[PDB]
Write an enzyme that holds these catalytic residues in place. Structure first.
Site, PDB file in Angstrom:
ATOM      1  N   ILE A 113      42.260  38.255  41.209  1.00  0.00           N
ATOM      2  CA  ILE A 113      43.145  38.948  42.081  1.00  0.00           C
ATOM      3  C   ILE A 113      44.560  38.308  42.145  1.00  0.00           C
ATOM      4  CG2 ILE A 113      43.600  39.990  44.477  1.00  0.00           C
ATOM      5  CD1 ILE A 113      41.044  41.061  43.138  1.00  0.00           C
ATOM      6  N   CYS A 114      45.762  38.924  42.400  1.00  0.00           N
ATOM      7  CA  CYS A 114      46.956  38.146  42.437  1.00  0.00           C
ATOM      8  C   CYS A 114      47.690  38.319  43.693  1.00  0.00           C
ATOM      9  CB  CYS A 114      48.089  38.732  41.512  1.00  0.00           C
ATOM     10  SG  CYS A 114      48.302  37.786  40.054  1.00  0.00           S
ATOM     11  N   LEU A 115      46.901  37.896  45.165  1.00  0.00           N
ATOM     12  CA  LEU A 115      47.549  37.998  46.162  1.00  0.00           C
ATOM     13  C   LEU A 115      48.448  36.630  46.462  1.00  0.00           C
ATOM     14  CD1 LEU A 115      46.048  40.348  47.162  1.00  0.00           C
ATOM     15  CD2 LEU A 115      45.562  38.982  49.094  1.00  0.00           C
TER      16      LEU A 115
END
Ligand SMILES: [Zn+2]
Ligand SMILES: [Zn+2]
Ligand SMILES: [Zn+2]
Lengths: 394, 146, 77, 123, 701, 9, 79, 75
Positions: free
Chosen positions: B83-85
């Site tokens: 994930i790229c939060l």
């Protein structure tokens, strides 16, 4: 004169029983004794029964019967068998001779002709391979066509093992997935490791897994959907690369240059085999014999009971990635494309010379052979490039 | 950093959110496994996406590594389930808790950020065909989540 | 003995009473006797683990007030 | 219990039940008349059965071919697998590892074999 | 060699063996030698097997001719005796031809036309049964089984013999194939017809209650019979067919009689009715429905008998509901075998009954039941004149826990119980801390720890308050005298459900008191905010203006007026308001509560805003310390969708109206849906590609 | 967000 | 004569904080309560321009890692 | 009516709002009641982002409901 008196009084079965205990040479000798002896051997299908017994007690003969096709007539003028036996012996001799000579066919893969297999396992019908694209490919053993593709793993599928009911794979996403070998529906998912799972083995309802987290986990498999962690083996100071086991002990090879032997009964530390200069990449434990291929470019053979270095094999110019063995040879594959075939019978003998152990060095490819599995007739390997190579020796 | 994690688990066991559930795996209180239920009126309807949370040693002051376990179709989630939060890479704040990060991810499941995506091959189809994407994501959900 | 709540997708908290040593199968069945969803289209989730149909309700460390989540599996065989 | 076995000549022998039941023939039969087995071979089989309730069997068989053949017949008529199996294995051992001429010289067989040349070329 | 002489001798020996002659064993061994030498000449010995088969066939043919066309009763004994003798003869014959037997079985390579010696004798005998006596013996044994109609004592062995014969006669290939089909089919059909007739006749001149006993006895008898002389395999099949045909046809009558049985206290009959219907598969539906409806009606009726004085008395209410639930629970546990389905019916019934009680209508709010429950629990835990025992208190608490488990709005009960617990703790009315703790723990274990959280906080806070009061009283030893005994229960504003609605005047005396308390309080908290609550403070006063030194317990209001009278008592309501600052809606009530006795009177009374309230000296009360302190639109769609997909995947082929009827029958039990909702749900499912529109809705993969 | 021997085994 | 005096008096009072619990967004503890890393054995409270407060030992470390308020992305400064 | 909102500090609060106010107004009320600017605010309900330029009725938010407040995020 037994062979003539026994059938004279109607005890033909007793006479045939007497002649059945003979071998090939003794049988032909008896067949060349007299007319009555010859009649008994012919009428009783003595040659046929001999071939049947051989097929029942030898794997090589069985494999040849199923591959060559003459086994179809097993289990017919009674002459076909007597004349077939020499041909079978001839074929077996040609097999072993080409094994020591270096003959093959190298059947390639027939699919889109497009890689990176990390673990492979085959049978007479399919070839299961754990690719690096987070998928598992199942190919046909005869036509070599890409049959099915199983997707669902988050990371790359590192290791895998299957049986007649399921397919258990361990990927890099730190998860173990249990698939259905027949249909292919994900039956279960085990989330217990903190790092990528490197190896796993399972049999008789029990399983063992080793991950990069420097830990080992044993599981009790009551069904494909009922797996429960039993114990957590700790003690390794590095990434456990390979783990094998049986009903007596469980062997664990990690990058800490050591080998650990625990008791399968209650996970009791039995021994620790030391001697490897670097980490161990592959290992096989069976029949109370352990064969390990480490990074020191050497193959070490040991006795599980005493843990004594029976023999160190040199010659590999790179890291010995994988290694397998049977009751006759030891096939090893290192980084540099070089399949080294060694003799096991000569290795187990302490009087044989080291120079007389390396039988052959098959060099047809160059990529790092990641996996390779063999039997009495072929060798299936997989490297970085060259998706799958089949080394047939017939 | 065990007291903070224990308190977070206590809160999750006391006031559980709408579509979030996270609990420890085994004895290692630093390795949790969460779940995210596909929000309604979205291609991920009636789906359950399993996650995997791993807390560092200084978790209160360091974002915890969160990664998807089941494949999905999204411009911000590649095949490796990463994930790229931005709230997970550099803009992390000690105030954000697990019940908050999971909710943020759930919200991201509905509103993707095509600008600066993680999977161009998907973001392109999204910005160009907002119809086909709705079908592909649904099919993947029926193949893995369901 | 204890009382749990099977929160569905809408929000309706189906209050159910179970036994500390019950089986997830019984918990799944009690729902239909209170909601109408057969045990073939139920996926009870608790603390992030899809509740298995065999482990007892104690293996999941369930206590009173523990809210379980229920997601319908239309196919479900 | 002890069973009474009356040989062909008329001699009687007392044998325990636990061992006498080894031979399916006697077991199915239950003095016990044996018109095809005399006391000699009967005493030998009784000793073998009691000892079997190998090296000993070899010495017990280190007898001429005549008694061996008679033992074969007695074992068949009495249907005693064990005895029959061991005696057959022994004869087999007595056949293996010799050339055709050596075989004829072993059992005093006269070659009755064109015919000999035909079987030689075909084998 | 020669065979004619030895073969004829062996044949004569065999002939002598077929008849139980019991000749010298020497002949047996001689015959064994004959068969042994005969198998000496695959062709060897074939003549022997052929002769044996031919002789067996001839002997059986002669026997059948001797015993052919006999009565339907003697045939049974005849066949039994002949079969026994034939079995013995064949067994010994096999023992004789054992050599030949073993040879053949190990020579012909089974997989020609031979089977074995014993097997050959059996197969051959299967020519004296099939054509000559297959019907006769079967009809005879059937006639006997039916003769059991009068309980006559049959041989009990003449049947077992035929059964064992049929079984052994099983396919002698490579097994109850020839036995099951023939004997079973006949026995099953006969017993089925017999039971149908018996039941139809018994139900014409007898009640259902008696028929239940007769049916149970018949089932047990049939189960024992088939277990004694019949085979054990036909035990399951026969029992199933019997329990099916004997109860199915009368299931409706069972349903009808169930209501009448429920009316009275007939437990035995109920238990037997359940044992009989439970034996059948999926027949308990209407039974559970009837039980639920009856329990609900009984509950409502039992509560009607006390609705006149229920809204004012909780004890009787909870006791009535408790009695109804206790009786039905004991019934479901003892008679219905505590079935997992019936207990659910009792649950739904008690729930609907406690939530739609008639007493609720008298209050127009479904929240009256938890309120009454809370009041009852409070009365139980309150410190009354007497103290009940410990065990009885714990038991009644458990019962209260049960009635609580059946409530619907537990939050309202939490709020009510909280208010009551607060009033108890403040007024020092708790009976025993152990009881309160046990009740709190019970509530915790019942509905988790989050509910009990606030209650426990309240408990710990009262304790802390007591400690702080002790500390303040300890620091009072310094130069800080108080002209009155002071104390205080400082509670935490985070849990108590108390609020501020007074905004009192704080008189001169209480001025110094409050100031000193704050002065001391400026030592434990900084952001301290004592939101003083005067509508809870107590108050004790002494008076010398009367004839004696009276005492009277009151609140801050009464104390306020009493102390406000320390000046010209000729004060009006406005003059008192000039120094009290109390809201009208509450000040008027305060003045009334004060004058609701003879302490403050006027010059059913009607107070005025201008009337004066002078000092009252003629107050002669007969007591002292007189206490004047008087107090789903979306759920429907979801269930419809689930039912639709279930039916679709179940059949895979239907129509719209058919689907409607199916979902209507599978959902009716829950509630009543609407057709437009079903249509809209079908369209919704179409949006998710769960079903389609065939180029009519078909199931989708 | 943007971006941020192959033998794993 | 006119003796209207109180002898015994018992009242109740609810204590509360200044504005809110001001729950430390770091250890989820109470500001007046002892710090978390301080409990496992001088722990004062620090505030920010945003009116946000935390413990000194908590905000100190958060600042050591990044000089930004944890509840909001604005800068940080004491009083 | 009234709604419930959970702030980042763990504490919970309630706001008195009608189904006519806009989301921007809701965020403003949350700011004055808590002290967080609206630029760093994100409202989530039933796992969905709440757009600023709209009103509570557009999302079918009944009374006594709950709203989760989180920080801002992006790709
Ligand atoms: Zn702090
Ligand atoms: Zn501190
Ligand atoms: Zn701030």
């Amino acid at each position: 004169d037994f062979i003539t008196a026994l059938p004279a009084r109607g005890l033909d079965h007793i006479a045939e029983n007497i002649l059945s205990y003979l071998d090939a040479k003794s049988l032909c000798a008896a067949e060349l004794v007299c007319k009555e002896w010859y009649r008994v051997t012919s009428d009783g299908m003595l040659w046929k029964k001999l071939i049947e017994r051989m097929v029942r007690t030898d794997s090589l003969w069985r494999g040849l019967a199923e591959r060559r096709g003459w086994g179809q007539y097993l289990f017919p003028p009674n002459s076909f068998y007597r004349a077939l036996y020499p041909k079978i012996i001839q074929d077996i001799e040609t097999i072993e001779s080409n094994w020591r000579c270096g003959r093959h066919s190298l059947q390639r893969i027939h699919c889109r002709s497009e890689k990176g297999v990390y673990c492979l396992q085959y049978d007479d019908q399919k070839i299961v391979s754990g690719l690096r694209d987070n998928t598992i490919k199942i190919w046909d053993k005869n036509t070599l066509e890409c049959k099915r593709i199983l997707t669902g793993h988050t990371g790359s599928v590192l290791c895998l093992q299957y049986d007649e009911r399921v397919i258990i794979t361990g990927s890099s996403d730190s998860t173990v997935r249990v698939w259905d070998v027949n249909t292919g529906e994900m039956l279960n998912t085990l989330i217990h490791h903190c790092e990528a799972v490197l190896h796993l083995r399972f049999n008789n309802g029990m399983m063992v897994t080793c991950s990069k987290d420097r830990s080992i986990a044993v599981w009790d498999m009551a069904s494909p959907t009922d797996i429960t962690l039993r114990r957590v083996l700790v003690g390794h100071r590095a990434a456990v690369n390979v783990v094998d086991f049986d009903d007596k002990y469980i062997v664990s090879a990690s990058g800490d240059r050591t080998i650990k032997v625990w008791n399968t009964s209650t996970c009791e530390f039995v021994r620790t085999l030391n001697g490897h200069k670097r980490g161990i990449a592959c290992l096989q434990y069976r029949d109370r014999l352990v064969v390990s291929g480490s990074s020191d470019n050497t193959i070490r053979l040991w006795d599980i009971e005493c843990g004594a270095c029976l023999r160190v094999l040199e010659g590999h110019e790179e890291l010995v990635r994988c290694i397998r063995f049977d009751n006759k040879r030891i096939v090893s594959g290192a980084y540099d494309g070089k399949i080294k075939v060694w003799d096991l019978v000569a290795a187990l003998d302490p009087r044989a010379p080291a120079g007389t152990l390396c039988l052959r060095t098959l060099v047809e490819h160059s990529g790092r052979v990641f996996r390779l599995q063999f039997d009495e007739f072929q060798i299936v390997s997989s490297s970085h490039d060259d998706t799958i190579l089949i080394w047939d020796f017939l | 950093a065990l007291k903070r994690i224990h308190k977070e688990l206590n809160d999750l066991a006391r006031d559980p959110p709408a579509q979030i559930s996270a609990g420890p795996v085994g004895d290692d209180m630093f390795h949790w496994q969460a779940t995210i239920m596909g929000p309604n009126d979205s291609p991920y309807q009636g789906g359950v996406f399993f996650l995997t949370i791993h807390f560092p040693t200084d978790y209160p002051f360091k974002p915890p590594k969160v990664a998807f376990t089941t494949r999905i179709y999204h411009p911000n989630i590649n095949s490796n389930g990463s994930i790229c939060l931005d709230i997970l890479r550099s803009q992390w704040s000690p105030a954000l808790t697990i019940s908050k990060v999971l909710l943020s991810i759930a919200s991201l499941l509905d509103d993707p950020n095509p600008d600066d995506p993680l999977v161009p091959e998907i973001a392109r189809i999204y910005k160009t065909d907002r119809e086909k994407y709705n079908r592909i994501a649904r099919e993947w959900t029926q193949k893995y989540a369901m | 003995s204890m009382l749990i709540k099977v929160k569905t997708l809408t929000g309706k908290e189906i209050e159910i009473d179970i036994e500390p040593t019950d089986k997830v199968e019984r918990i799944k069945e009690r729902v239909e006797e209170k909601e109408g969803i057969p045990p073939q289209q139920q996926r009870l989730i608790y603390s992030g683990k899809q509740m298995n149909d065999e482990k007892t309700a104690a293996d999941y460390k369930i206590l009173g007030g523990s809210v379980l989540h229920l997601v319908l599996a239309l196919r479900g065989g | 219990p002890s069973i009474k076995l009356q040989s062909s000549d008329g001699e009687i022998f007392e044998v325990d039940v636990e061992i006498a039941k080894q031979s399916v023939t006697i077991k199915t039969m239950l003095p016990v008349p044996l018109p095809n087995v005399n006391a000699a071979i009967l005493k030998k089989v009784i000793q073998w059965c009691t000892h079997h309730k190998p090296v000993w069997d070899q010495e017990f068989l280190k007898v001429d071919q005549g008694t061996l053949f008679e033992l074969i017949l007695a074992a068949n008529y009495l249907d005693i697998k064990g005895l029959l199996d061991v005696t057959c294995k022994t004869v087999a051992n007595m056949i293996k590892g010799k050339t055709p001429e050596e075989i004829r010289k072993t059992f005093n067989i006269k070659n009755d074999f064109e015919e000999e040349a035909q079987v030689r070329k075909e084998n | 060699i020669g065979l004619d002489q030895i073969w004829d001798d062996l044949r004569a020996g065999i002939q002598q063996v077929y008849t139980r002659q019991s000749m010298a064993k020497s002949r047996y061994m001689e015959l064994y030698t004959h068969v042994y030498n005969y198998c000496t000449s695959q062709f060897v010995g074939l003549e022997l097997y052929k002769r044996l088969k031919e002789f067996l066939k001839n002997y059986l043919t002669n026997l059948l001719k001797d015993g052919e066309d006999l009565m339907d009763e003697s045939v049974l004994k005849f066949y039994t005796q002949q079969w026994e003798d034939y079995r013995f003869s064949s067994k010994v014959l096999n023992g004789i031809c054992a050599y030949l037997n073993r040879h053949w079985v190990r020579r012909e390579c089974d997989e020609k036309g031979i089977y074995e010696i014993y097997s050959l004798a059996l197969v051959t005998w299967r020519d004296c049964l099939f054509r000559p006596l297959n019907k006769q013996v079967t009809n005879a044994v059937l006639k006997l089984i039916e003769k059991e109609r009068n309980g006559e004592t049959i041989n009990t062995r003449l049947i077992s013999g035929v059964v064992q014969s049929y079984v052994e006669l099983g396919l002698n290939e490579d097994t109850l194939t020839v036995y099951k089909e023939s004997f079973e089919s006949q026995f099953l059909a006969d017993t089925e017809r017999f039971y149908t007739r018996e039941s139809t006749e018994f139900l014409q001149q007898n009640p259902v209650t008696e028929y239940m006993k007769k049916a149970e006895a018949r089932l047990l008898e049939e189960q024992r019979r088939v277990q004694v002389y019949l085979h054990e395999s036909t035990q399951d099949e026969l029992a199933r067919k019997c329990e099916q045909v004997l109860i199915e046809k009368h299931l409706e009558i069972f349903h009808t009689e169930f209501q009448n049985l429920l009316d009275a206290d007939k437990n035995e009959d109920l238990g037997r009715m359940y044992n009989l219907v439970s034996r059948i598969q999926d027949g308990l539906g209407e039974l559970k429905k009837l039980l639920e409806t009856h329990i609900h009606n009984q509950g409502l009726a039992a509560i009607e008998k006390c609705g006149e004085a229920a809204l004012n008395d909780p004890k009787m209410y909870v006791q009535t509901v408790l009695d109804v639930h206790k009786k039905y629970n004991a019934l479901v546990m003892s008679a219905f075998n505590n079935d997992a389905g019936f207990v659910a019916a009792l649950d739904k019934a008690c729930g609907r009954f406690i939530n739609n009680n008639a007493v609720t209508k008298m209050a127009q709010s479904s929240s009256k039941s938890p309120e009454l429950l809370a009041r009852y629990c409070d009365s139980l835990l309150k410190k009354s004149s007497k103290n009940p025992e410990e065990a009885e208190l714990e038991d009644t608490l458990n019962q209260v826990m049960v009635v609580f488990k059946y409530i619907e709005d537990k939050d309202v009960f939490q709020k009510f119980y909280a208010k009551m617990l607060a009033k108890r703790l403040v007024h020092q009315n708790s009976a025993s801390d152990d009881a309160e703790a046990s009740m709190i723990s019970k509530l915790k274990q019942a509905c988790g720890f989050e509910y009990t959280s606030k209650l426990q906080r309240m408990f710990q806070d009262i304790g802390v308050s007591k400690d702080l009061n002790e500390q303040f009283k300890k620091h009072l030893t310094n130069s800080e005298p108080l002209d009155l005994d002071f104390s205080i229960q400082v509670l935490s504003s985070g849990s108590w459900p108390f609020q501020q609605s007074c905004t009192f005047a704080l008189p001169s005396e209480l001025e110094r008191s409050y100031q000193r308390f704050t002065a001391f309080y400026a030592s434990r908290h900084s952001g301290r905010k004592l939101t003083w609550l005067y509508q809870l403070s107590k108050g004790e006063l002494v008076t010398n203006c009367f004839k004696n030194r009276y005492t009277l317990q009151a609140s801050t209001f009464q104390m306020a007026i009493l102390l406000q009278y320390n000046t010209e008592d000729a004060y009006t309501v406005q003059q008192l308001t000039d120094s009290t600052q109390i809201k009208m809606d509450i000040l008027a009530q305060v003045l009334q509560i004060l004058l609701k006795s003879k302490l403050l009177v006027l010059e059913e009374v009607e107070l005025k805003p201008d009337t004066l309230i002078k000092l009252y000296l003629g107050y002669k009360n007969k007591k002292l310390r007189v206490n004047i302190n008087v107090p789903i639109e979306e759920d429907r769609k979801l269930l419809i969708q689930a039912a639709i997909v279930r039916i679709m995947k179940m059949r895979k082929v239907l129509k719209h109206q058919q689907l409607l009827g199916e979902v209507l029958t599978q959902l009716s039990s829950r509630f009543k849906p609407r057709v437009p909702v079903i249509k809209k749900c079908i369209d919704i499912l179409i949006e998710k590609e769960y079903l389609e529109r065939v180029d009519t809705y078909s199931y989708l993969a | 967000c943007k971006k941020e021997r192959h033998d794993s085994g | 004569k006119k003796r209207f005096e109180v002898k015994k008096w018992n009242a109740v009072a609810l204590w509360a904080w200044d504005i809110v619990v001001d729950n430390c967004a770091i250890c989820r503890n109470h500001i007046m309560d002892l710090c978390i890393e301080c409990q496992a054995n001088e722990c004062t409270v620090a505030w920010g321009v945003c009116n946000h407060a935390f413990h000194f030992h908590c905000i100190s470390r958060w600042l050591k890692t990044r000089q930004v308020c944890p509840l909001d992305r604005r800068e940080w400064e004491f009083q | 009516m009234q709604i419930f909102v959970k702030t980042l500090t763990g504490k919970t609060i309630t706001l008195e709002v009608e189904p006519s106010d806009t989301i921007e107004n809701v965020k403003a009320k949350i700011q004055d009641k808590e002290g967080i600017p609206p630029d760093q605010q994100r409202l989530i309900f039933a796992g969905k982002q709440l757009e600023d330029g709209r009103t509570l009725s557009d999302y079918n938010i009944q009374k006594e409901s709950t709203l989760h407040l989180v920080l801002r995020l992006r790709g």
